[PDB]
Symmetry: C2
Subunit: 331 residues, 2 copies
């Protein structure tokens, strides 16, 4: 009965040169200090965002997985690696290259470290190919971004991808990215605080209200990050709209709240009360422990929030261990 | 007693009276022969179908009797903001609407009270208009968090709040639609996603910019629709403030400390969500709002509060207490 944290990130050892072979303006790459303790994700010549050793160093990662008490970690690509705006073939190469890095990262000790794969989601055919290929090679599932430009999960291209995954029994983690807002949310990390949970909610409602869950096989294992954003809280607002407006009701047959039996969320909500509403809405079976390691905005003491909760001992075990062992079939 | 502090009206404006300001941007009210329906018209195009309750105080009174609702605070439909029009035309528009709300109210000023609207695109015009209208009998103001082309929180908006803080003008802040552009086209998603989020953004903008430090605690200000997702996501904000010096930069106390500087209405449509809202705002800072008459307003006004596991003093505060002191209503 170990701790399994199923939402962490990594960034591969890519040089400006190798990145430039893909796109000297848009391919992210990794610059490490000469010491080797600090580092920066770089976009072309520009500095994207400063980072640290646990993101790229698998040996170093463990030592922190030890002091935190985490026994198995699922990790996946930092969202800046997605490449959804690039040209299909170039992106398909990129995903493959990235997914091999993830295996090299993982293979250092593939018992405590599982990976998820990225896919050229702008191109359905290549995206399925990469998903299958990658899982067959070791990955325990896929992580995708919650939208693709003006396409939300209700889009047929994205509904088809989910359907491929269900049929192939490949678990998906859905991550918000490329946040809405435009020029309204520069300061104070507002995009992490306002737009990310809104993106996630939108993803979730898009599946539910479009009807998608009626068409997508119940075998689909799908998980949303950040506790489903602000979903659980505004659900009542949503049922109410379904109950009193035909246009909200058109493509959605059952009341939206019944659909929480079709997906999973992570536990990253940062507040005991918020976590108790979340479990209430989702059930102890559908909530998995996620940290967002090693980003500053993640919980510094992984598992801490759940562990301190006024929750059943069985509930805690599930969220901390049980649910992801099933979901990702880690054993 | 029982107060509804969140609701709307629209005026009996003809196409021609509208035409004066604009015959294609100023909205007007079309009414059927069997005056039970009709709709808000923009130019000559149907803008939105509208039930008789949205005008006619008489009819509303009778619905206010069915619904056990003793007093109602009602303000403009966001359509008639016009925070995009030229500063002066919008001040003249603002002027008229605020009179319309006064004739609407002069049909039962015990049971019907109104807030005014401002030409927020111009600080002075908006300031003056505000002072005038409360003096005219409006119990306060409703503003959006937007202008249509605004960025939601700058030193300008802060200045306005300060004016109202000083002249004791109470404020209801009401959310905008457009955040997600060419997305959210179906299922009323702007109402379900964009609006909650806008409202959380308005709140967090006051808190993280440090505005509450520079604003007189006499500021009386309420956020619509439960504060959007604010209460549920507050944990996330505190965590950021604690681990990112940039979040902390202009915010000297943890953001959750500032909940004593503002109010929220209770429309969260769910008992579990209402308990959490209360746990965060405290029973003293949540008021009963229905968003009547709109289809997405609560249908049985008060029902979620009345039917809850809150205390009994708690319920009297939400139903009655808070709104009495907030607006000054006895
Ligand atoms: Mg589309
Ligand atoms: Zn993440
Ligand atoms: Zn409203």
């Amino acid at each position: 009965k170990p701790r399994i944290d199923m939402h962490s990130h990594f960034f591969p050892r890519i040089s400006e040169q190798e990145a430039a072979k893909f796109d000297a303006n848009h391919a992210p790459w990794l610059q490490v200090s000469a010491k080797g303790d600090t580092g920066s994700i770089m976009m072309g010549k520009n500095n994207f965002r400063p980072v640290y050793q646990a993101l790229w160093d698998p040996a170093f990662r463990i030592e922190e997985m030890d002091a935190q008490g985490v026994d198995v970690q699922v990790t996946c690509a930092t969202p800046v690696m997605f490449g959804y705006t690039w040209e299909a073939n170039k992106a398909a190469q990129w995903a493959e290259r990235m997914n091999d890095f993830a295996l090299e990262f993982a293979a250092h000790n593939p018992q405590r470290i599982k990976v998820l794969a990225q896919v050229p989601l702008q191109d359905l055919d290549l995206a399925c190919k990469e998903a299958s290929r990658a899982v067959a090679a070791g990955h325990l599932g896929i992580q995708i971004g919650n939208h693709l430009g003006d396409k939300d999960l209700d889009d047929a291209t994205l509904e088809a991808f989910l359907t491929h995954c269900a049929n192939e029994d490949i678990p998906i983690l859905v991550h918000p990215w490329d946040m809405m807002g435009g020029q309204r949310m520069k300061k104070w990390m507002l995009p992490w605080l306002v737009a990310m949970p809104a993106e996630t909610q939108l993803a979730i409602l898009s599946l539910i209200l479009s009807g998608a869950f009626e068409r997508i096989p119940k075998s689909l294992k799908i998980c949303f990050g950040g506790g489903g954003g602000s979903f659980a809280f505004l659900l009542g607002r949503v049922d109410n709209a379904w109950r009193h407006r035909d246009i909200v009701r058109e493509d959605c047959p059952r009341p939206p709240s019944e659909y929480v039996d079709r997906f999973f969320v992570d536990s990253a909500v940062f507040n005991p009360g918020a976590l108790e509403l979340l479990v209430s809405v989702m059930g102890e079976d559908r909530v998995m422990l996620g940290s967002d390691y090693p980003f500053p905005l993640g919980e510094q003491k992984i598992g801490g929030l759940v562990l301190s909760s006024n929750l059943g001992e069985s509930a805690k075990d599930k969220i901390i261990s049980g649910n992801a062992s099933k979901f990702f079939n880690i054993n």
